[PDB]
Design a binder for this molecule. Structure first.
Ligand SMILES: Nc1ncnc2c1ncn2[C@@H]1O[C@H](COP(=O)(O)OP(=O)(O)O)[C@@H](O)[C@H]1O
Ligand SMILES: Nc1ncnc2c1ncn2[C@@H]1O[C@H](COP(=O)(O)OP(=O)(O)O)[C@@H](O)[C@H]1O
Lengths: 569, 557
């Protein structure tokens, strides 16, 4: 397996060699211990049992050497387990900040969360709980088979050839057992999907007075499907029964072979009984592996998660208001294209609004500029410099963003705002707090900006959280500011804070805003109307309204939408 | 505890028979090891080849008999599970049509998919796999232990020497860190949350970074330090606790205890043979009981959840669009008021509005009128009838509603508009759609009115909302319960949704969950709520003249 070897740090590539050679030494000592039953038992069942003392002396000497190598491999197992835990978690935590934001789909995020959180106690005990029993049980039937060659060549060939048959039975049993679980899971999911739809649309059905016809329809469908699916059952042996049957048949086959030799005179009776015991020592590891099928299945899953995270794609890498240029930009979330040949130049030092219907590609533009994502085709440039070719520190300092979601984290409110630039002076924080209109919120909080705003701290409303986020973006000294409007419906002060951020900031920098309502774009210098991933209209506020284009119609709808009253016009 | 056993009440007789068959099958699976001991006793006694043949035939027939029983049990146990699971899905289906309609918007509870798909599958593994696997895991060590004690009681006792050393070291290792075993699940839960936060707050860490970037890293290092400090001191205990149970250790104890007995004449050497065959792996058999009983626990938790859902309360039935609320109070959780002493009269044809801060209980009071929950105290009356006395056919024919997160059923658009009244013709449906400002996009679809809809569709939030508003218009309910958040759910489609709601609201009693006070100026009756209690009631201008909490809210706008 290649993923597990990749987890090994460079420090422990030596200790893995010691672990491997001592694991082989352990398997050889167990095999010699099992084959030492051939003379020990053959003398125990003989006319003179007293000849068994010598082979018990060698057996216990092999046993003590077995314990010494077994504790050393366990010690190296615990050391490798902790080293693998620290190595993978730290390398996995260092990987993700460099990963492109396209990778973080909900399913990919689920694996990354699983790989980080649920792999703690498992990786620490991976090698001791799984590899050492797995490797010892896998190599021991072949070790005993090879060792019996020195007792009898055809015997060792027969016992060694039986390893291939019995491992084949394990593989076939694994295939049948997993296919059965696949069918059992899928059939149940086919039965219950109608029930999930019935529970999903319950408000629609109940309010529409159709709940009972819909309930009967689903009940009839379930009844017919079960009646058809119950008759398809047939008397199948499961996977585990197949393997246990293969073990017993091997047991009776070897015992019958030993007795047949005894009747032919080719073996003595004590030696035949001893071979019967040793050929039970040989079959026993196959049962030991079958007990590791659940543990091996889970470990294969989590290592697949860790492989997925560690194989995530990473972005490449190399104070006046820069100009933002778009040239033939195309970007897609896999196959779903969101931008189709978009091209524009944001004039340096000016505020450009971005507007359009729901969906579209408005938010994707700001994520491209800030370096969260790299374009699939075309280029995004800052003063003629490609964003991808920028150094990591330069790109971090280049752009400031106000996100759709505030993304507040556990900490004090001032700590939530100081992350923009910790080197800023207290007066800079006060000024950024004033423009963001968070000083009004400090009057509500008991401790002011020192109050905790985390999950276990204070429950800030949507508008207040956005005003904290605006405080982040204004504080940062980046030569570019990006805005993505999202406010609580009632909080008009949030719109006032956004207006102040666009206008009241004395810092010289290019500004971009994705907007939803007219209160912010009214102060903008120009507007880009984006629909279906393309700029269907472009111009200034006066230019666009004079033209009476799509933006004018959008302007009319929103202005009307800001004036209605229920029970009247 | 009884909730799990109460669901599996009808499966008492099949599960008992399944356990008995698995006990029988495991004994038949251990029988070949007994026959090898008889075979050795035959060989040492110089038995003729005829007796060796019969023993060989007996062993082969038992292998065939065990295979046949295990196949026959699997088929019969699958049929039992398939019949019980079908019964259960029928019961879950009927319960989902009787639960209170607010049960589908729960907080802090398992999803419907987990309760229906995952838990019903966990029951299927419980009945068919976990119980027979647990019965085998308990009967195999017990059958082995009894046989090895019958063979010889002296070498059987020294099989417990590694067992006592395991339990003693397990007990020493457990008390020595008993606090940490209790902390460890909570560390995992904390890290699951922090991993979610780190993955959620990724863009901030990209562009801002700073304390946010190293917060997760430092807490990850604390967790790894906790695991290492917790488990590293138990290397010595855990290694010694593992070597004692190994087959190599059992074999040495068996032979060092049996060879002195055999050599000195205190034992028949064939009485040591049962221990060499079965007793070497005896330690690994006892360690398999725990995994066997774990399967029962995991399945019984799922049986716990399913029976808990089936034990929920339902909507009991007792006994011009005017609505009367009279001394209504409501508890989501016991002893935690959310509505307290609210009284209102939504006069016929008048638009009543609920206003207040977030968490004031305004949304709940609209959910109560539609009967998403039953009021714990007081009453709500519609057209002079308490809503408790009304059936779902009667109540929702009088009290329609369009709340947030509207839904579309699997079917064509024509059924979705005409869901309330399928007998309506396409002319009536088209007028209703044009009334809701959706006819334009419907014709814009390739298939027109025959366009199929369901759990996944290309329509945006505003578009499916206007489809639902078209449904409500064609439902013709004199009373209406409306959530103002449906308007600004799609700001780009805001004006169209407003026109649809404007058309919907006419000659109909209306209840509004208002969030923007500037959309309320012409409502017939404003209601101000904070912490579940009505503060002021009156028209827009009258309350502004009063200058109470409503004017403070308006100034806060
Ligand atoms: N995590 C994601 N995975 C796949 N597609 C996404 C993801 N996030 C956004 N999109 C796509 O982006 C489009 C919306 O563009 P966006 O710039 O977000 O506009 P808006 O700001 O109006 O949402 C959607 O059609 C959606 O398919
Ligand atoms: N999903 C939920 N399930 C159960 N109870 C809830 C849920 N969400 C909120 N609650 C409770 O009901 C109340 C609803 O508050 P309310 O003010 O009506 O909502 P809004 O802030 O949208 O107006 C809250 O105070 C809370 O205690």
């Amino acid at each position: 397996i290649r993923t597990l070897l990749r987890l090994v740090p460079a420090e422990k590539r030596g200790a893995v060699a010691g672990y491997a050679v001592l694991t082989l030494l352990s398997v050889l000592l167990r095999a010699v211990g099992a084959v030492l039953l051939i003379p020990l038992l053959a003398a125990l069942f003989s006319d003179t049992p007293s000849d068994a003392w010598l082979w018990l002396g060698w057996l216990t000497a092999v046993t003590l050497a077995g314990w010494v190598t077994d504790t050393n491999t366990a010690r190296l197992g615990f050391d490798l387990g902790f080293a693998v835990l620290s190595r993978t978690q730290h390398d996995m935590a260092d990987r993700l900040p460099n990963v492109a934001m396209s990778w973080f789909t909900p399913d990919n995020t689920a694996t990354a969360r699983q790989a980080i959180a649920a792999t703690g106690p498992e990786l620490a005990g991976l090698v001791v709980n799984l590899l050492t029993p797995l490797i010892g049980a896998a190599l021991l039937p072949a070790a005993i088979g090879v060792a019996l060659l020195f007792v009898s060549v055809p015997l060792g060939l027969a016992a060694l050839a039986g390893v291939a048959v019995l491992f084949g039975a394990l593989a076939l049993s694994g295939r049948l057992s997993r296919a059965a679980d696949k069918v059992a899971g899928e059939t149940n999911s086919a039965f219950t999907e109608r029930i999930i739809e019935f529970a999903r649309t319950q408000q629609a059905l109940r309010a529409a007075r159709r709940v009972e016809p819909a309930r009967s329809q689903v009940g009839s469908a379930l009844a017919a499907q079960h009646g058809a699916g119950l008759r398809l059952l047939t008397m199948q042996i499961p996977g585990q029964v197949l393997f246990s049957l293969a073990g017993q048949v091997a047991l009776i086959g070897f015992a019958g072979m030993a007795v047949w030799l005894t009747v032919r005179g080719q073996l003595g009776v004590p030696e035949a009984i001893a071979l019967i015991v040793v050929l039970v020592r040989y079959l026993e590891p196959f049962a030991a592996i079958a007990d590791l099928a659940p543990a091996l299945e889970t470990t294969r899953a989590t290592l697949n998660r860790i492989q997925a995270v560690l194989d995530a794609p990473t972005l490449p890498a190399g104070g006046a208001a820069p100009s933002i240029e778009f040239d033939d930009v195309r970007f897609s979330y896999g196959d779903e294209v969101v931008l189709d040949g978009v091209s524009f130049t944001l004039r340096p030092g000016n505020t450009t609004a971005i507007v359009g219907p729901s969906g579209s590609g408005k938010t994707t533009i700001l994520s491209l500029i800030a370096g969260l994502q790299q374009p699939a085709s075309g280029r995004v440039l800052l003063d003629g410099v490609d964003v991808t070719t920028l150094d990591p520190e330069a790109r971090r300092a280049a752009v400031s963003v106000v996100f759709q979601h505030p993304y507040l984290f556990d900490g004090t409110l001032r700590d939530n705002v100081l992350v923009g630039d910790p080197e800023a002076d207290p007066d800079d924080v006060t000024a950024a707090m004033r423009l963001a209109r968070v000083d009004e919120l400090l009057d509500r909080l008991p401790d002011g900006d020192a109050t905790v705003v985390g999950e276990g701290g204070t429950a800030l409303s949507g508008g207040e959280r956005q005003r904290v986020s605006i405080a982040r973006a204004l504080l940062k000294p980046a030569p570019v500011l990006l805005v993505d409007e999202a406010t609580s419906a009632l909080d008009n002060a949030n719109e006032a804070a956004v207006v102040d951020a666009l206008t009241a900031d004395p810092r010289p920098r290019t500004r971009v805003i994705v907007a939803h309502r007219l209160a912010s774009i009214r102060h903008a210098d120009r507007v880009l109307f984006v629909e279906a991933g393309r700029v269907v209209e472009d111009g200034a506020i006066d230019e666009l309204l004079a033209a009476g284009g799509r933006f004018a119609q959008f302007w009319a709808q929103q202005q009307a939408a800001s004036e209605w009253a229920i029970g009247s016009t | 505890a009884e909730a799990g056993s109460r669901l599996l009440a009808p499966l008492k007789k099949p599960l008992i028979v399944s356990g008995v068959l698995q006990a029988l099958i495991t004994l038949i699976e251990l029988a070949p090891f007994v026959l090898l001991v008889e075979l050795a006793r035959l060989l040492l006694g110089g038995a003729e080849a005829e007796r060796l043949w019969t023993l060989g035939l007996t062993a082969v027939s038992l292998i065939g008999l065990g295979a046949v029983l295990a196949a026959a049990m699997t088929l019969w146990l699958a049929r039992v599970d398939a019949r019980f699971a079908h019964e259960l899905r029928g019961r879950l289906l009927t319960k989902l049509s009787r639960l209170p309609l607010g049960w589908f918007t729960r907080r802090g509870s398992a999803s419907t998919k987990q309760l229906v798909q995952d838990d019903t599958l966990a029951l299927a593994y419980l009945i068919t796999a976990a119980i027979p696997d647990a019965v085998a895991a308990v009967v195999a060590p017990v059958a082995v232990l009894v046989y090895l004690f019958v063979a010889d009681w002296r070498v059987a006792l020294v099989l417990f020497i590694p067992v006592l050393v395991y339990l003693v070291l397990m007990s020493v290792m457990t008390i020595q860190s008993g606090s940490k075993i209790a902390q460890a699940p909570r560390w995992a839960e904390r890290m699951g949350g922090e991993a979610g936060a780190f993955l959620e707050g990724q863009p901030v860490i990209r562009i801002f970074g700073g304390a946010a970037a190293s917060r997760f890293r430092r807490r990850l290092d604390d967790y790894i330090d906790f695991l290492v400090s917790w488990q590293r001191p138990f290397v010595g205990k855990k290694t010694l606790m593992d070597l004692v149970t190994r087959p190599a250790t059992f074999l040495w104890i068996i032979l060092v205890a049996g060879v002195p007995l055999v050599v000195t004449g205190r034992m028949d050497p064939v009485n040591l043979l049962p221990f060499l065959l079965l007793g070497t792996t005896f330690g690994a058999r006892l360690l398999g009981i725990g995994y066997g009983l774990s399967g029962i626990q995991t399945g019984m938790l799922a049986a716990r959840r399913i029976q808990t859902v089936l034990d929920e309360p339902e909507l009991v039935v007792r006994d011009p669009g005017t609505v009367e609320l009279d001394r209504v109070s409501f508890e989501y959780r016991p002893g935690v008021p959310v509505i307290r002493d609210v009284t209102l009269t939504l006069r016929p044809g008048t638009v009543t509005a609920l206003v207040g801060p977030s968490g004031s209980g305004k949304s709940t009071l609209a959910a109560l009128v539609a009967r998403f929950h039953d009021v714990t105290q007081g009453a709500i009356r519609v057209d002079g009838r308490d809503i408790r006395t009304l059936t779902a056919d009667e109540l929702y024919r009088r009290v329609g509603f369009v709340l947030q997160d509207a839904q579309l059923v699997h079917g064509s658009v024509a059924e979705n508009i005409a869901l309330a009244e399928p007998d309506a013709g396409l002319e009536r449906i088209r007028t209703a759609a044009r009334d809701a400002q959706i006819h334009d996009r419907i014709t814009r679809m390739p298939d027109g009115y025959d366009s199929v809809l369901g759990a996944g569709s290309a329509l945006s939030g505003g578009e499916r909302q206007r489809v639902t508003i078209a449904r409500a218009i064609l439902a013709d309910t004199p009373v209406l319960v409306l959530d103002e958040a449906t308007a600004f759910a799609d700001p780009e489609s805001e004006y169209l949704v407003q026109q649809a709601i404007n058309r919907l609201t006419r000659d109909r009693t209306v209840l509004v969950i208002a969030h923007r006070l500037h959309t309320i100026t012409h409502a017939d009756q404003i209601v101000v709520l904070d912490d579940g209690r009505i503060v002021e009631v009156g028209t827009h201008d009258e309350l502004l003249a009063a200058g109470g909490r409503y004017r403070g809210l308006w100034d806060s706008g």
